[PDB]
Ligand binder design. Structure first.
Ligand SMILES: [Mg+2]
Ligand SMILES: [Zn+2]
Ligand SMILES: [Zn+2]
Lengths: 1202, 50, 468
């Protein structure tokens, strides 16, 4: 129907064209008949009939008289809905300036005729005069003339000059302007001037003027003469209950405007004194400003409820505005909500739906089937049977539900696994039964959480739910690729208890033919579940090439592992089960099952793991008791010794040997070592036991305590919680952050006294308050990230570029933090990977790194590899498949046309709630910086080189010495300059000293061309350079934190990309969160969209402005093919907030935030939004250019190419 | 004003405990009932008390 | 320095000082003699006295209201007849001495002055006064248009030389014909426009044939009088703006803002200045107070409610509230609609009707709960909407009716469809169905009867039964 949305200024002719009539009087409805009166705010002639196909006077009161206007009443007989589309207008007695065009800084009326806003507003509130037509006088345009000064001017000239006052004066000043010649005045003035402030103001005003000339808008339209009036149902006046009425504040604002305009017309008729007319015009301006944007021009007008009125702007903007409350998030039909319980009998693709919800949601489908099988003759009969809850309705429901997926959602939806499609199984009760294995994806636990239920209707929606949104297809985390269906809690406890080893158990040493024999033995109460036996295991290995090699050997194991081998699918080793299985071991089982078997085997295996774990956790009888917390006998002795030593240091403070701070920092260490020793003693006592073997000897065994098993299995619990259970609670922090000297020496088993409980509450309250504020901040950060990265879609398969990013293992000292295999898993190479010390092409170009090539790259020991990145992608819009690489949630290469930016934003923002020279390796050493390389090509250690046991190439053996996370992530993503930026060397050259002028220090750099560039340096800076030394570009001048801007300016794109990537990944990795670097790279690519032109070249760009980088690529490519000289640019780094408000489309920018200035700029410049993004297509209600809707848009583009 | 008659009806409903209802102790141990188990299926002691 | 219009209006009001009472009387006499000047000016026009005295002729026969026509008499039909007949007599002297004794004769001027002096002792209705002013205003207008047209045609010094006496004479055109300047060709081409110029105004200028020289100077006295009077009333209104503010003081928080009350008080003040008489010996303050309070109260009644209530019902509501207040004070409880009826001597049913008048509507933005995110506007349902079930039922009913009508004879189906308007753009009586076929009233009536008996049979009605 439509392809774009234009925005511009509304001329009075256009406003009159929109309107169906003129509103003249402020009356709304009659107080007796409750009927619209004539020419009022609800007039039936202007806006349309109140009742469908009727009229006010009742003369034409049926459909036969459509399109016929009554002579008695003037109302066109049509539907009532036309009242939500018909507009009106008010002919203002005097022109009124637009409030947005005047106080949306910068003012576009002040900056179009070169006059300050104080002067302009002095003219609008009718305080001074301004000359329009100087004529043949000494005055010029825009001169202030005070009232008395204007009397003198009238005395000595009189009729020669016109010096008007008010909005009319602004209107005819803008009338007298000639934009072409005035822009040429800019053009000739810019070259002559030298000051930077004047030049910047001049180019701002030139940009505005050129926008006016290009858009076709006239400055005359800047000031309103005809005021449009909104349709009445958009500002309804309706009877709530029993004669009480509900209205909208727009009615009050329009009533004020109409009343004051009528008063102005009456005053003009009566030839009133000038003061009264002037005051009336002032109130007309105030009322129109309050109608358009209340609370901006002055004090907000308040209603009878002592609350400010809501204007047009206040309801097109804000969180509670139209955009974010009704156009991006909508209440929907065919929806339900209920408490969630646990269904341990369900499968991954099944969810338990109550029959009441199924009956209410699937009602039209039930009607359809009842009519098609003829049980109900018509819809009324079908409704009667459905309401009566007849027997056959349930069979019809179980036939409609049979293969119809349903979408389950939980609030908040932090990532895309928060909405999933399931096949419904109909159940009694009122609670939704959820499969346990998906709870971790929902962050859902059954203490009262509720979930929402959505029924897709069209065939395309059902196919999308079954193919993309099924829980079976969603088993890998899109953030990292790790499985998300890993078992937890009861399953892990059961599998751990089943896979444990007990010494001298019943049936030890028996020989078993296989897993079935072991099951038979345990069911017959012959061999205990933890009895060591020898079992004949048949085992199939599925090699990387597809070889299926079967083998059969006798393995020493337990009965439990033999049974668990029954559910393990063929193709996996027995070494994956022949060990005690904690959370990590089961996660590895699922990971390897997915890697070597696929998805179907993995989902069946996950289900069977869940059932086996539940069954054996039930049969185990794990119970927590009061004798399970074994408090060590060494705790009391350690407390006594700590008290004695604290008293010793207490009688040593009076000796003056120590200070108060030293006493504090020594008592803290005394107690913080007593705590560690008590914890270690408790762990040693709790994790071991002494048993009697078959021979009769006393042998040490790992303990079977309930709390120890809970902690060691990884089900739920950790060492710190045990230490607070049976050891010492420890030192605590005061509400200011200080640590109380006397710790809590009692645990929860023996209880605390009053003071200890008070101190504990001091920290509990902080934890809760910080959780709440953390949730708020993480939500805001995720929203900003989505709004910056919403336009990144994989649009091509290959951009045909040669650039890439190098990657090496991450080293932060003498140990590896993360290997190259983890970094490069799933990234397409950029250049051929040569064998170390050889010209052999081990890995060719344009290959995707799976686990097979990861094993290859680990075995052949290569350190640095070049791979493609999203930041280096050359795609004009979005990215290409090869530069992104592997889709983490699918395991294969990224498909064409999926939103990778939204995935990146969700992956980065989801873990926000969780966010708070000795030599050891043999090898050689080298200088780069300092590196220590092992025997192979891997560089094991990396250390900085300050301004020396061994020289370069000297072999070194072991032991030979040479000698607020979330605020940080937000700070990095908004590119905030640090408090004390570290100065960098702008140009390569020799340092030379200048003159220490008053205030601060100066330096100079001498370039290779003889240029002397002056550098401003604060006095407190600890300079790290010496005169006579040639420093390189980007070298550190003063030590300190580095802003991303100067890294981008003086080092490059790759440098800033790496800087942001690892300085966000350090925050994530410190907390234990795994996020792939492609997401941060995508955000960085969106953060580097802008460039400033420096050389005009043969392009039309004027140097000194910001433009999008893709536009410059297109222009430069065209100019190169034409042969004319290209354009030269500088690439700029913008924060995730500025970049979003600087998008080409104004609808997305308006929907994000800062609506007033976005709309003002768009209207003044006359922009066109081509609807080429996710958010604009969501707002307008058409298919998004991503996923299933990608190809469709492509065809439209093809239809727009021809 | 405007109303001629008001009739007020009190309805008493006996709500039984069912899956989905929230049950709790006095130590922060909340929960949602997942199943109403038959008596013969639940654990019992030596004297036979389930 | 300030952004509040109220304080700015206060500043511009404070610049005008409060003049003394002697100054107030001086302004009053300034308006009085300005009115006398404009009154005597419009007298010097040969149609004013006829119109005044044909109005007198109409009112003497009591065809028009006597009180409305005459505002009063100044003392420097008991007495009005005397003055009207005296004006009759000096008009008889005048329109006889106007031409018989010559226009330029000093006796004619003296008789005109006598008539002026006699009429001066009259104060008349403002409506007819305005009529008299604009009657001469239109004449001035078209003669100005003629001279501006001849200016546009010719573009001078010679015209100004004969602008004293020959600006409206044939002699000017004759002498223009006598000119032989190099540009007499262009004014010759403009002579055709002149022939469309000086004929146009020459049917009105002879209506007041003396005033040809004198239209311009009578308009000169017109401008003098109007400017003088408007200056005087401007000064008085600007002086008493402070009284306007003091009066508007006690009407705040009544649904209308302060500045609107001030402006309505300004309207009242201008009305009071228009009809103020200092010869009462009475201060302005009281008369101004009455008029300003009237304007403020009327505007509050007319513009302080979303659903407008007329002034009289507003007074009824105010009296309702006041008497409820008195009865609550007297008897300690809130008055009931029974007891409140007898003290106001107005029926109980109308007391209730006034009580059930809708109050000020509640905004759709009001916070429903303690939270600021829930508003009244989200809890209001669209009741005019049609349910999708009803639309499906309507479509099914149309289909079933079509299927049933398919089981009848073509003529019978046609008569049923035409007399109940199905699948057509209108409904029809049996006359139209009779005319469309070759068939009469009773025939069509009984074909419809036969159709309804056919469809009342149970065999072809089970489907339609489910639609009820
Ligand atoms: Mg919960
Ligand atoms: Zn009508
Ligand atoms: Zn690419």
């Amino acid at each position: 129907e439509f392809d774009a949305i234009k925005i511009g200024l509304a001329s009075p002719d256009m406003i009159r064209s929109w309107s169906f009539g003129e509103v003249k009087k402020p009356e709304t409805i009659n107080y007796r008949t409750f009927k619209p009166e004539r020419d009022g705010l609800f007039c039936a002639r202007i806006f349309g009939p109140v009742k469908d196909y009727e009229c006010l006077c009742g003369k034409y009161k049926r459909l036969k008289h459509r399109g016929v206007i009554c002579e008695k009443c003037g109302v066109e007989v049509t539907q009532t809905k036309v009242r939500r589309d018909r507009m009106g207008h008010i002919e203002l007695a005097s022109p009124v300036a637009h409030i947005w065009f005047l106080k949306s800084l910068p003012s576009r009326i002040g900056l179009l005729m070169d006059m300050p806003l104080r002067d302009i507003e002095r003219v609008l509130y009718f305080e001074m005069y301004v000359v329009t037509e100087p004529g043949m006088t000494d005055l010029e345009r825009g001169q202030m003339l005070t009232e008395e000064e204007y009397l003198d001017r009238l005395e000595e000239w009189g009729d020669e000059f016109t010096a008007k006052m008010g909005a009319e004066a602004i209107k005819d000043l803008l009338a007298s302007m000639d934009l072409p010649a005035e822009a040429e005045q800019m053009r000739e003035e810019l070259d002559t001037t030298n000051s930077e402030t004047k030049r910047k103001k001049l180019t701002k005003r030139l940009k505005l003027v050129e926008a006016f000339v290009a858009s076709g808008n006239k400055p005359e339209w800047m000031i309103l003469t005809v005021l449009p009036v909104l349709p009445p149902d958009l500002r309804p006046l309706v009877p709530l209950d029993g004669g009480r009425f509900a209205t909208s504040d727009l009615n009050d604002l329009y009533r004020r405007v109409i009343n004051r305009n009528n008063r102005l017309k009456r005053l003009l008729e009566l030839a009133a004194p000038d003061i009264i007319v002037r005051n009336e015009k002032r109130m007309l301006q105030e009322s129109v400003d309050a109608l358009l944007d209340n609370g901006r021009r002055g004090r907000a007008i308040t209603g009878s409820n002592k609350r400010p009125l809501k204007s047009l702007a206040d309801m097109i903007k804000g969180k509670q505005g139209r955009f974010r409350q009704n156009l991006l998030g909508k209440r929907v039909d065919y929806s339900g909500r209920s408490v969630i319980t646990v269904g341990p009998y369900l499968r991954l693709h099944q969810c338990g739906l109550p029959k009441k919800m199924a009956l209410e949601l699937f009602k039209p489908f039930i009607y359809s089937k009842l009519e098609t099988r003829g049980l109900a003759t018509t819809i009324k009969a079908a409704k009667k049977m459905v309401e009566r809850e007849e027997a056959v309705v349930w069979d019809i429901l179980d036939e409609v539900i049979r293969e119809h997926p349903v979408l389950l959602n939980r609030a908040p939806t932090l990532h895309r696994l928060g909405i999933q499609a399931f096949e419904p199984v109909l159940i009694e009760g009122k609670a939704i039964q959820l499969h346990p294995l998906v709870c971790a994806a929902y962050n859902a636990d059954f203490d009262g959480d509720q979930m929402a239920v959505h029924v897709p209707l069209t065939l395309e929606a059902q196919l999308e739910a079954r193919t993309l949104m099924m829980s079976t297809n969603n088993i890998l985390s899109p953030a990292s690729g790790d499985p998300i269906i890993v078992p937890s809690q009861d399953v892990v406890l059961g599998l751990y208890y089943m896979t444990r080893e007990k010494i001298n158990a019943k049936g030890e040493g028996m020989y078993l033919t296989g897993p079935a024999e072991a099951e038979k033995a345990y069911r017959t109460k012959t061999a205990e579940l933890h009895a060591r036996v020898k079992v004949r295991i048949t085992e199939t290995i599925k090699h990387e090439n597809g070889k299926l090699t079967t083998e059969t050997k006798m393995i020493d194991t337990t009965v439990g592992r033999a049974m668990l081998w029954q559910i393990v699918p063929k193709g996996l080793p027995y070494s994956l089960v022949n060990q005690k299985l904690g959370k990590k071991q089961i996660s590895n089982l699922l990971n390897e099952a997915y890697r070597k078997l696929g998805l179907k085997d993995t989902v069946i295996f996950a289900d069977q793991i869940m059932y086996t774990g539940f069954a054996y956790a039930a049969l185990s009888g794990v119970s927590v008791g009061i004798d399970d917390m074994v408090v060590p006998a060494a705790k009391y002795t350690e407390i006594a010794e700590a008290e004695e030593e604290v008293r010793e240091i207490q009688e040593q403070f009076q000796s003056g040997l120590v200070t108060a701070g030293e006493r504090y920092n020594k008592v803290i260490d005394i107690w913080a070592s007593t705590n560690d020793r008590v914890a270690k003693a408790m762990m040693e006592n709790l994790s071991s036991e002494q048993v009697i073997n078959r021979q009769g000897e006393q042998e040490k065994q790992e303990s079977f305590n309930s709390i120890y098993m809970m902690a060691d299995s990884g089900a739920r619990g950790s060492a710190a919680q045990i230490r607070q259970l049976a050891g010492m609670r420890g030192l605590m922090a005061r509400p200011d952050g200080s640590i109380i000297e006397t710790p809590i020496t009692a645990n929860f088993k023996e209880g605390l006294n009053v003071l200890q409980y008070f101190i504990s509450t001091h920290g509990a309250r902080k934890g809760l308050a910080d959780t709440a504020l953390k949730t708020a901040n993480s939500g805001y950060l995720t929203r900003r990230l989505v709004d910056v990265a919403q336009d990144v879609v994989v649009t091509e398969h290959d951009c045909g570029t040669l650039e890439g990013v190098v990657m090496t293992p991450h080293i932060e000292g003498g140990d590896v933090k993360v290997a190259l295999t983890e970094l490069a898993l799933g990234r397409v190479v950029s250049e051929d990977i040569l064998k170390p010390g050889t010209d052999e092409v081990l890995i060719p170009r344009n290959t995707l790194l799976d686990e097979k090539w990861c094993k290859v790259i680990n075995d052949n020991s290569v350190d640095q590899i070049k791979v493609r990145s999203v930041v280096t992608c050359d795609s004009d819009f979005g990215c290409c498949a090869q530069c992104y690489g592997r889709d983490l949630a699918r395991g294969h290469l990224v498909n064409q046309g999926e939103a990778v930016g939204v995935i990146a934003a969700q992956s980065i923002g989801e873990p926000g709630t969780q966010l708070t020279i000795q030599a050891k390796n043999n090898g050689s050493v080298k200088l780069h910086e300092l590196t220590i390389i092992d025997e192979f090509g891997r560089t094991k250690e990396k250390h900085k080189l300050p301004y020396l046991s061994k020289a370069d190439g000297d072999a070194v053996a072991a032991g030979e010495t040479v000698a607020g996370g979330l605020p940080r992530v937000a700070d990095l993503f908004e590119a905030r300059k640090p408090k004390e930026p570290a100065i960098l060397a702008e140009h390569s050259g020799t340092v030379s000293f200048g003159k220490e002028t008053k205030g601060k220090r100066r330096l100079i750099i001498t370039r290779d061309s003889g240029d002397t560039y002056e550098e401003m340096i604060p006095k407190h800076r600890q300079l790290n350079v010496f005169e006579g030394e040639r420093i390189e570009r980007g070298d550190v001048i003063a030590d300190g934190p580095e802003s991303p801007h100067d890294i981008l300016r003086l080092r490059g794109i790759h440098a800033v990309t790496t800087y942001i990537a690892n300085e966000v990944q350090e925050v994530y990795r410190l907390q234990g969160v795994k996020i792939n670097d492609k997401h941060i790279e995508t955000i960085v690519r969106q953060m580097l969209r802008k460039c400033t032109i420096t050389f005009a070249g043969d392009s039309e760009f004027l140097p000194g402005e910001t433009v999008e980088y893709s536009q410059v690529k297109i222009a430069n490519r065209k100019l190169v093919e034409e042969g004319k000289e290209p354009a030269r640019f500088e690439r700029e780094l913008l924060g995730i907030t500025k970049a979003s408000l600087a998008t080409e489309s104004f609808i997305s920018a308006a929907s994000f935030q800062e609506t007033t200035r976005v709309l003002t700029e768009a209207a003044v410049s006359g922009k066109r939004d081509d609807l080429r993004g996710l958010k604009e297509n969501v707002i307008v209600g058409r298919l998004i250019p991503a996923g299933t809707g990608f190809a469709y848009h492509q065809d439209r583009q093809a239809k727009r190419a021809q | 004003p405007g109303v001629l008659k008001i009739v007020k009806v009190y309805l008493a409903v006996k709500r039984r405990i069912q899956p989905g209802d929230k049950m709790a102790g006095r130590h922060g141990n909340k929960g949602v009932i997942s199943k109403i188990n038959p008596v013969e299926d639940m654990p019992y002691d030596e004297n036979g008390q389930p | 320095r300030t952004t509040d219009p109220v304080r700015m209006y206060m500043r511009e009001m404070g610049t005008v000082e409060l003049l003394t009472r002697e100054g107030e009387i001086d302004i009053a006499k300034r308006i009085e003699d300005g009115i006398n000047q404009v009154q005597s000016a419009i007298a010097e026009y040969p149609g004013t006295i006829p119109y005044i005295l044909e109005q007198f002729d109409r009112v003497q026969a009591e065809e028009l209201r006597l009180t409305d026509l005459i505002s009063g008499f100044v003392d420097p039909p008991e007495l009005a007849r005397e003055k009207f007949n005296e004006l009759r007599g000096k008009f008889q002297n005048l329109q006889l001495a106007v031409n018989e004794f010559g226009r330029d004769s000093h006796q004619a001027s003296e008789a005109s002055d006598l008539v002026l002096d006699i009429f001066r002792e009259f104060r008349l209705t403002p409506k007819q006064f305005d009529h008299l002013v604009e009657t001469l205003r239109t004449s001035m207008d078209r003669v100005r248009t003629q001279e501006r047209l001849v200016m546009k045609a010719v573009v001078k010094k010679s015209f100004i030389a004969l602008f004293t006496g020959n600006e409206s004479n044939e002699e000017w055109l004759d002498k223009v014909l006598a000119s032989d300047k190099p540009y007499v060709a262009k004014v010759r081409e403009q002579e055709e426009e002149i022939r469309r110029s000086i004929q146009k105004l020459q049917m009105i200028e002879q209506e007041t044939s003396l005033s040809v020289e004198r239209i311009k100077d009578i308009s000169h006295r017109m401008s003098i009088g109007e400017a003088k009077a408007r200056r005087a009333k401007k000064e008085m209104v600007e002086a008493n703006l402070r009284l306007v503010i003091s009066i508007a003081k006690k009407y705040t928080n009544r649904g209308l803002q302060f500045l609107d009350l001030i402006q309505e008080g300004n309207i009242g003040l201008m009305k009071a200045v228009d009809k103020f008489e200092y010869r009462r010996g009475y201060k302005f303050s009281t008369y101004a107070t009455w008029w300003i309070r009237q304007a403020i109260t009327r505007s509050i009644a007319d513009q302080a409610r979303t659903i407008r209530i007329p002034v009289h019902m507003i007074e009824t509501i105010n009296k309702l509230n006041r008497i409820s207040r008195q009865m609550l004070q007297e008897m300690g409880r809130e008055p009931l609609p029974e007891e409140l009826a007898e003290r106001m001597q107005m029926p109980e049913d109308k007391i209730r009707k006034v009580l059930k008048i809708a109050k000020e509507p509640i905004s759709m933005e009001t916070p429903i709960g303690d939270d600021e995110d829930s508003h009244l506007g989200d809890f209001i349902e669209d009741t005019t909407l049609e349910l999708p079930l009803d639309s499906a039922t309507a479509t099914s009913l149309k289909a079933a009716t079509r299927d049933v009508l398919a089981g009848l004879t073509p003529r019978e189906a046609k008569v049923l469809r035409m007399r109940f308007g199905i699948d057509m753009n209108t409904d029809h009586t049996l006359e139209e169905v009779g005319k469309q076929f070759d068939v009469t009233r009773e025939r069509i009536r009984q074909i419809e009867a036969k159709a309804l008996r056919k469809l009342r049979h149970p065999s072809r009605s089970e489907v339609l039964r489910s639609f009820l």
